[PDB]
From a paper:
To investigate whether Hyp binds to HypD in the Cγ-exo or Cγ-endo pucker state, we modeled and refined both configurations of Hyp into the electron density and found that the electron density maps are best fit by a Cγ-exo configuration. The Cγ-exo puckering of the pyrrolidine ring orients C5 of Hyp in closest proximity to Cys434, prompting us to propose C5 as the site of hydrogen atom abstraction. The distance between C5 and the sulfur atom of Cys434 is 3.8 Å, a typical distance between the site of hydrogen atom abstraction and the catalytic cysteine in other structurally characterized GREs. Hyp is positioned in the active site through a series of hydrogen bonds that include: Glu436 of the Cys loop, Asp278 of the β1 strand, Ser334 of a short α-helix between the β2 and β3 strands, Thr645 of β8 strand, and a water molecule that interacts with Asp339 of the β3 strand. In HypD, we also find that Glu436 is positioned to hydrogen bond with the hydroxyl group of Hyp. In HypD, Phe152, Trp277, and Phe340 are in contact with the substrate, with Phe340 positioned to stabilize Hyp through a proline-aromatic interaction, which is characteristically similar to a cation-π interaction.
All GREs use a glycine-centered radical cofactor for catalysis. In agreement with all characterized GREs, HypD is dimeric with each monomer consisting of two five-stranded half β-barrels, anti-parallel to one another and surrounded by α-helices.
Author numbering: 1 to 789
The structure:
């Protein structure tokens, strides 16, 4: 019986979870062929498009057994392509990723030999990663190696965008027509940018040709496979696939079935064009599918079950696409196979009214049934959302596998407008990746890396010296033993923050240039608003909205650490700075008195305690002020968001003991959640604390909450969950997502992981299999506060 409402979706789901994660070298081979043929003869954008077209023209293509939506990134499910133009793996990288315990990728010997003999000799010098690393300053390299921040674009393309509605209203033949109209009207006399516009537009036209080739090829393959298929029912499925691919992606979808296939084709495209962060997502899928759903049921070619079956197929298709292999710091900061394909169900419709429709509930049923950690199927809750939809979402959340996450539609809309989006565009918006607010289909909102806010406090406390790397990573802001007031230390901290943010942004500017010049994405550009009209690649600012983020990690840890110092060193004067640093250097060994004071007798973030929460506000504002408004190379601005993925593990690992009681090498806090052991007053206290962070001034904040399974039972639990979401959202909280697990199931899962392969927990903005997480990350989740109502 298992999972899947129909036989078909049961089978596709079973194939999905059994697919072995491996690398598919075919993309690298084909991209090398295209470069050796075209490199040096065309501009880089056209070169990218021609390579993508050459790849789409010659890649093998698979229709899995029983599929209705067709298309895989790699050779087979969980087959990750490689991206040697971004990161050309060394042979040791292939070794590490093949043999690592968690998030491994099998490197077949055929892939290994090809990479060593065909890929490395060509791409070792061309990969953008070396371009980036060789262009970085010494202080950047030291800070990067010291774990002060991470670099999102060392192994992945900026990506991090969401489909809008263009692909349902237009085909790629239509988009090629729009691009050809832009080309005809380019003014090379007066528009001094016309050359760059032409190169980008010409590239987008090729991407449209490539998307059209993709549909022709799949329809031909489907018909061809129908000719040898002896099963009439499967033959008809293949004929339906062919009929679907005759329409999409060349023409706009006319049916609900075609709308989904159009999305997934675009998904495959943009996600093999570049190893883009957060893969891709349809965004407001229920908004886009509903007119197709109503039009199809009225016409009698679709019913609620066929609608659900198709969406369950789409769910499996997401689950077949791992985030391509990461190594080094990129693995540490994103230690997961998931690619954060974040779907927003519910929210408001384009006119700003309640968006919950029939497809909204179909989607809820699909995520419930499929229980797949991809896509990241979440709900947007508006003050206009009918309680039935919120309560139904809680029915799924309380089942304890993390999804759905809850996003505050009104927060999203206001954040977008705060970043400069029109209300018209904001109403099309939502969250992607973990919690990242974006105007879907109209924005490049690029994450550039995690910022180790607690370690900046550490540098502050060591006069710029990093006691872990034993290098002078920061600047000399003074011996804190000489600071006579908390304010002075916090000023010293802001100075360290300014220095570190300066190093990060400086590298980002170099990196943003490298991605703009060396990673143009003509395919993505065809569907993202304003790119065609501007004649400007998405990668150099063609989106209507352009934001860059540095994601702040460890706000809880650093808040409590600064609170511990304000309370104990300056306020109550239980000990002085010199003692605290001695305690920190000793990992609190021999300072049990101090460790207890800062852990249990000092105000803590997440209890509606203004003493600690105002410190959180000062730190968050210091971060917001330090980053927000900085220009991006391509005419946008930096903004701030708070979200860690797995980087709160790494950031804790390369950090020493912190003034809040956190021990050396221990994780820093995740998202904007309280520090480990910090919230002792229940969830209402934490959502009130978290609401004091100005979510509207961010591009998203991540709140993890965990509930004891007993308190979410029945209608009382649903109502309590629904009220907590609404109470947090009524205060403009941005996001809340729930763990509902039995601590003993996870403890046993650690002891016998082979018995709990099913076990999914919520990490940070996503759900993952518990066994894919390091022991440190597992214990971090376990250490999260079990809340009761
Ligand atoms: O894998 C990650 O780290 C991406 C980055 C943010 O979109 C959240 N998820």
């Amino acid at each position: 019986m298992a999972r899947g409402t129909f036989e078909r979706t049961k089978k596709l789901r079973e194939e999905s979870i059994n697919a072995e994660p491996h690398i598919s070298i075919e993309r690298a081979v084909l991209m090398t062929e295209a470069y050796k043929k075209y490199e040096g003869s065309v501009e880089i954008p056209v070169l990218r498009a021609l390579s993508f077209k050459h790849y789409i023209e010659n890649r093998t293509l698979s229709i899995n057994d029983g599929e209705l939506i067709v298309g895989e990134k790699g050779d087979s499910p969980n087959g990750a392509p490689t991206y040697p133009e971004i990161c050309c793996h060394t042979m040791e990288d292939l070794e590490v990723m093949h043999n690592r315990d968690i998030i491994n990728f099998s490197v077949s010997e055929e892939a290994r030999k090809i990479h060593k003999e065909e890929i490395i000799p060509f791409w070792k010098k061309r990969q953008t990663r070396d371009k980036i690393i060789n262009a970085m300053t010494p202080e950047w390299l030291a800070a990067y190696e010291a774990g002060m921040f991470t670099e999102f674009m060392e192994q992945r393309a900026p990506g991090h965008t969401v489909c809008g509605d263009t692909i349902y209203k237009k085909g790629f033949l239509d988009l090629k027509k729009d691009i050809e109209a832009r080309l005809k009207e380019l003014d090379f006399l007066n528009d001094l940018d016309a050359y760059n516009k032409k190169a980008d537009l010409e590239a987008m036209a090729i991407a449209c040709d490539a998307m059209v080739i993709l549909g022709k090829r799949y329809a031909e393959k489907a018909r061809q496979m129908a000719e040898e298929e002896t099963d009439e029912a499967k033959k008809k499925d293949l004929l339906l696939i062919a009929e679907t691919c005759d329409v999409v992606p060349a023409h706009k979808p006319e049916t609900y079935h075609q709308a989904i296939q159009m999305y997934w084709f675009v998904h495959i495209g943009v996600t093999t064009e570049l190893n883009i962060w957060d893969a891709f997502t349809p965004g407001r899928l229920d908004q886009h599918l509903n007119p197709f759903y109503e039009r199809d049921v009225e016409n009698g070619i679709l019913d609620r079950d066929r609608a659900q079956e198709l969406l369950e197929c789409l769910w499996v298709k997401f689950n077949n696409q791992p985030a391509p292999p990461k190594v080094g710091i990129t693995l540490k900061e994103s230690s997961t196979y998931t690619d954060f394909a974040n779907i927003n169900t519910g929210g408001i419709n384009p006119d700003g009214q309640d968006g919950v429709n029939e497809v909204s509930y179909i989607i809820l049923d699909v995520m419930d049934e499929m229980k797949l950690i991809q896509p990241s199927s979440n709900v947007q809750i508006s003050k206009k959302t009918p309680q039935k939809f919120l309560k139904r979402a809680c029915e799924i959340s309380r089942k304890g596998w993390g999804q759905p996450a809850f996003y505050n539609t009104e927060a999203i809309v206001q954040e977008l407008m705060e970043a400069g989006k029109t209300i018209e565009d904001a109403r099309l918006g939502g969250t992607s990746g973990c919690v990242e607010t974006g105007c879907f289909g109209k924005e490049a909102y690029v994450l550039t890396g995690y910022m180790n806010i607690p370690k900046i406090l550490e540098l502050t406390l060591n006069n710029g010296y990093d006691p872990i790397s034993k290098k002078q990573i920061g600047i000399e802001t003074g011996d804190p033993r000489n600071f006579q007031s908390y304010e002075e230390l916090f000023e010293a901290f802001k100075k360290q923050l300014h220095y570190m943010i300066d190093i990060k942004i400086e590298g980002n500017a170099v990196i943003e240039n490298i991605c703009a010049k060396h990673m143009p994405c003509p395919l993505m550009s065809t569907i993202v608003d304003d790119c065609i009209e501007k004649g400007k690649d998405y990668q150099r600012g063609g989106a209507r909205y352009n934001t860059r983020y540095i994601q702040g990690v460890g706000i809880g840890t650093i808040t409590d650490s600064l609170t511990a110092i304000k309370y104990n060193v300056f306020d109550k004067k239980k000990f002085d700075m010199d003692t605290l640093l001695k305690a920190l250097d000793a990992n609190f060994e021999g300072y049990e008195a101090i460790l207890n004071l800062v852990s249990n007798k000092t105000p803590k973030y997440g209890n509606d305690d203004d003493y600690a929460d105002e410190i959180m506000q000062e730190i968050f504002n210091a971060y917001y002020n330090e980053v927000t408004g900085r220009p991006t190379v391509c005419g946008g601005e930096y903004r701030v968001d708070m979200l860690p993925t797995t980087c709160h593990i790494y950031f804790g690992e390369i950090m020493g003991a912190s003034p809040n009681g956190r021990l050396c090498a221990k994780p820093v806090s995740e998202g904007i959640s309280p520090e480990k052991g910090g919230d002792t007053n229940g969830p209402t206290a934490v959502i009130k604390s978290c609401a004091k962070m100005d979510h509207i001034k961010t591009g998203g904040t991540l709140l993890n909450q965990r509930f004891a399974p007993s308190v979410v039972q029945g209608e009382k639990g649903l109502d309590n969950m629904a009220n907590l979401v609404r109470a947090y959202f009524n205060m403009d909280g941005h996001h809340i997502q729930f763990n509902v697990f039995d601590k003993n199931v996870l403890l046993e899962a650690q002891k016998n992981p082979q018995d709990y392969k099913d076990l999914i927990v919520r990490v940070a903005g996503y759900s993952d299999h518990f066994n894919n997480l390091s022991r440190t990350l597992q214990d971090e989740i376990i250490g999260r506060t079990e809340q009761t109502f």
